[PDB]
Design an enzyme around this catalytic site. Structure first.
Site, short mmCIF file in Angstrom:
data_model
loop_
_atom_site.label_atom_id
_atom_site.label_comp_id
_atom_site.label_asym_id
_atom_site.label_seq_id
_atom_site.Cartn_x
_atom_site.Cartn_y
_atom_site.Cartn_z
N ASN A 89 67.34 15.53 23.06
CA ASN A 89 68.44 14.90 22.34
C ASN A 89 68.33 13.38 22.42
O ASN A 89 67.87 12.80 23.42
CB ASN A 89 69.82 15.35 22.89
CG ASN A 89 70.26 14.53 24.07
OD1 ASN A 89 70.88 13.48 23.91
ND2 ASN A 89 69.94 15.00 25.28
N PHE A 97 75.09 8.13 22.69
CA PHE A 97 76.47 7.85 23.10
C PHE A 97 77.43 7.84 21.91
O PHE A 97 78.27 6.94 21.77
CB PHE A 97 76.57 6.51 23.84
CG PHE A 97 76.22 6.54 25.31
CD1 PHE A 97 76.12 7.72 26.03
CD2 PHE A 97 75.96 5.34 25.96
CE1 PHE A 97 75.77 7.70 27.38
CE2 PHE A 97 75.62 5.32 27.31
CZ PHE A 97 75.53 6.51 28.01
N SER A 136 71.26 7.29 30.79
CA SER A 136 70.94 7.83 29.48
C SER A 136 69.61 7.25 29.01
O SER A 136 69.40 6.03 29.10
CB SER A 136 72.02 7.51 28.46
OG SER A 136 71.51 7.75 27.15
N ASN A 163 68.85 7.00 25.95
CA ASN A 163 69.04 6.79 24.53
C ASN A 163 69.85 5.54 24.21
O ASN A 163 70.27 5.36 23.06
CB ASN A 163 69.70 8.01 23.90
CG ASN A 163 68.90 9.28 24.13
OD1 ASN A 163 69.44 10.33 24.52
ND2 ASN A 163 67.59 9.17 23.94
N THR A 164 70.08 4.67 25.19
CA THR A 164 70.70 3.37 24.96
C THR A 164 69.76 2.30 25.50
O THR A 164 69.39 2.33 26.68
CB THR A 164 72.08 3.28 25.61
OG1 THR A 164 72.93 4.29 25.06
CG2 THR A 164 72.70 1.90 25.37
N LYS A 220 75.22 8.46 38.25
CA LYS A 220 74.30 9.45 37.69
C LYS A 220 72.96 8.80 37.38
O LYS A 220 72.90 7.80 36.65
CB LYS A 220 74.89 10.09 36.43
CG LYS A 220 73.98 11.23 35.89
CD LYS A 220 74.74 12.04 34.85
CE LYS A 220 73.84 13.17 34.30
NZ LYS A 220 74.63 14.00 33.32
N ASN A 277 70.01 13.09 35.12
CA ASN A 277 70.07 13.06 33.66
C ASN A 277 68.79 13.70 33.08
O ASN A 277 67.94 14.24 33.79
CB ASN A 277 70.27 11.62 33.20
CG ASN A 277 71.14 11.51 31.98
OD1 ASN A 277 70.93 12.24 30.99
ND2 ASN A 277 72.14 10.62 32.03
C1 LIG Z 1 72.75 17.35 24.05
C2 LIG Z 1 72.97 16.69 25.38
C3 LIG Z 1 73.86 15.64 25.49
C4 LIG Z 1 74.05 15.01 26.72
N1 LIG Z 1 74.95 13.98 26.83
C5 LIG Z 1 75.15 13.37 28.05
C6 LIG Z 1 76.07 12.33 28.19
O1 LIG Z 1 76.77 11.90 27.25
N2 LIG Z 1 76.23 11.77 29.43
C7 LIG Z 1 75.50 12.19 30.52
O2 LIG Z 1 75.68 11.66 31.61
N3 LIG Z 1 74.60 13.20 30.39
C8 LIG Z 1 74.42 13.80 29.16
N4 LIG Z 1 73.52 14.82 29.06
C9 LIG Z 1 72.74 15.25 30.27
C10 LIG Z 1 73.28 16.48 30.97
O3 LIG Z 1 74.55 16.13 31.50
C11 LIG Z 1 72.34 16.93 32.08
O4 LIG Z 1 72.25 15.86 33.02
C12 LIG Z 1 70.94 17.28 31.58
O5 LIG Z 1 70.99 17.81 30.26
C13 LIG Z 1 70.24 18.28 32.50
O6 LIG Z 1 70.97 19.49 32.64
P1 LIG Z 1 70.56 20.79 31.78
O7 LIG Z 1 69.05 20.98 31.92
O8 LIG Z 1 71.34 21.92 32.39
O9 LIG Z 1 70.98 20.55 30.32
C14 LIG Z 1 73.34 15.45 27.84
C15 LIG Z 1 72.44 16.50 27.71
C16 LIG Z 1 72.25 17.11 26.49
C17 LIG Z 1 71.27 18.25 26.39
O1 LIG Z 2 72.19 10.50 23.86
C1 LIG Z 2 73.24 10.65 24.63
O2 LIG Z 2 74.38 10.44 24.28
C2 LIG Z 2 72.83 11.09 25.98
C3 LIG Z 2 71.83 11.99 26.10
C4 LIG Z 2 71.35 12.37 27.37
O3 LIG Z 2 70.46 13.21 27.57
N1 LIG Z 2 71.96 11.75 28.44
C5 LIG Z 2 72.96 10.82 28.37
O4 LIG Z 2 73.44 10.30 29.39
N2 LIG Z 2 73.38 10.49 27.09
#
Ligand SMILES: Cc1cc2nc3c(=O)[nH]c(=O)nc-3n(C[C@H](O)[C@H](O)[C@H](O)COP(=O)(O)O)c2cc1C
Ligand SMILES: O=C(O)c1cc(=O)[nH]c(=O)[nH]1
Ligand SMILES: CCc1oc(=O)c(Cc2c(O)c(CC=C(C)C)c(O)c(C(C)=O)c2O)c(O)c1C
EC number: 1.3.5.2
Length: 350
Positions: A99, A103, A169, A171-172, A209, A238
């Protein structure tokens, strides 16, 4: 949901969950799964990771799904749209997702009012062992990252059992450089001062995080700052900007953070290292590739007091939550642990 594009499927899943249309989970949490950490009781250690409910729309539906705690966000101070679509990709052959949302956020004010509409309901849930975390991000065009996080502390801190300073993240632009020592000490000093200025019953724990892609030096520095400042915990990890050898999905070379099974053991190893660097005195929420009780127990034994998942839910559906909890309880019994608490960090005492 599998048949739509991934982002559309996610929005449908959020809407469906928020309406409570899912039958209440049947798994009843046993006493073995209770954890006391971060100043709170957690009925079970399996939470929904940040990103599923970015804007706080489905909190009560997620508790109904069986999660022992819910984390919403990331939330940015001002609303922002994120990256152009498509920005989410399934890698079915890898049980993974990539992804690059960037944000996308309804912003602090909208989320504040959403949480306020259920603030006393949440107070009762928290007292009953079902705490709420709020994950804070920063706007793309903000010139002062620390002030963005400070605003988040002030606005959503009073509604949260814990806050997450998300500096990881992928992605920023420039975000992960906030993980460096000097930048991070200054940022976290400001965040903690703002937190300490909230009234007592509105004063959340503060966690950081972190990425799975840190150098050994980066991890040493984070551990040092966390202990110097009294940061309450870490969320580890993350998504990864690495692409482990062996990925099969056609979309493996899309830009973004990789989640799911290929991240799992990179995350577990980062938990292991951060637990050792903090002498087991800093609570860790372990996340990355959890889809089974074994996955959960491996992270707990490596040093996590709690775990989270997201990606597994999108492959195995809502039943994965009860599955993880039932398998975890069975494995704890098989391995001679009285409960989750006895297993936290057990690998380090072998
Ligand atoms: C689609 C998507 C969006 C995410 N958005 C955020 C986010 O906004 N903030 C954040 O701290 N982590 C975000 N994450 C990270 C998850 O919180 C997690 O740290 C990471 O995906 C690993 O866990 P998983 O393998 O169970 O998905 C996102 C992950 C995915 C897949
Ligand atoms: O693109 C985001 O918003 C996003 C994705 C991701 O994997 N982790 C995160 O902290 N933000
Ligand atoms: C952005 C990452 C991402 O997030 C999502 O939310 C979904 C939708 C989704 C889902 O939420 C659940 C979980 C069901 C609920 C009612 C909460 C699923 O069981 C599935 C499937 C196919 O079984 C599902 O596709 C995604 O496909 C992706 C790629």
């Amino acid at each position: 949901q599998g048949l739509l594009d991934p982002e559309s499927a996610h929005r449908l899943a959020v809407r469906f969950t928020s309406l409570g249309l899912l039958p209440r989970a049947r798994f009843q949490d046993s006493d073995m799964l209770e954890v006391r950490v971060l100043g709170h009781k957690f009925r079970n250690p399996v939470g929904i990771a940040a990103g599923f409910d970015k804007h706080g729309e489905a909190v009560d539906g997620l508790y109904k799904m069986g999660f022992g705690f819910v984390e919403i966000g990331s939330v940015t101070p001002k609303p922002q749209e994120g990256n152009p679509r498509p920005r989410v990709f399934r890698l079915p052959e890898d049980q993974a997702v990539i992804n690059r949302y960037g944000f996308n956020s309804h912003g602090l004010s909208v989320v504040e009012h959403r949480l306020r509409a259920r603030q006393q309901k949440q107070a009762k849930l928290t007292e009953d062992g079902l705490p709420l975390g709020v994950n804070l991000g920063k706007n793309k065009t903000s010139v002062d990252a620390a002030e963005d996080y400070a605003e988040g502390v002030r606005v959503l801190g009073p509604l949260a059992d814990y806050l997450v300073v998300n500096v990881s993240s992928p992605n920023t632009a420039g975000l992960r450089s906030l993980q460096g020592k000097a930048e991070l000490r200054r940022l976290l000093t400001k965040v903690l001062q703002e937190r300490d200025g909230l009234r007592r019953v509105h004063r959340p724990a503060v966690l950081v995080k972190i990425a799975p892609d840190l150098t050994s030096q980066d991890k040493e520095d984070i551990a040092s700052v966390v202990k110097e400042l009294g940061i309450d915990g870490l969320i580890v990890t993350n998504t990864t900007v690495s692409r482990p050898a062996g990925l099969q999905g056609a979309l493996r070379s899309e830009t973004g953070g990789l989640s799911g099974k290929p991240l799992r053991d990179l995350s577990t190893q980062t938990i292991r290292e951060m637990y050792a660097l903090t002498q087991g005195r800093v609570p860790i929420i372990g996340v990355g590739g959890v889809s089974s009780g074994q996955d959960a127990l491996e992270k707990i034994r490596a040093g996590a007091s709690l775990v989270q998942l997201y990606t597994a839910l999108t492959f195995w559906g809502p039943p994965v939550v009860g599955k993880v909890k039932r398998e975890l309880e069975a494995l704890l019994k098989e391995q001679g642990f009285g409960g989750v608490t006895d297993a936290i960090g057990a690998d380090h005492r072998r």
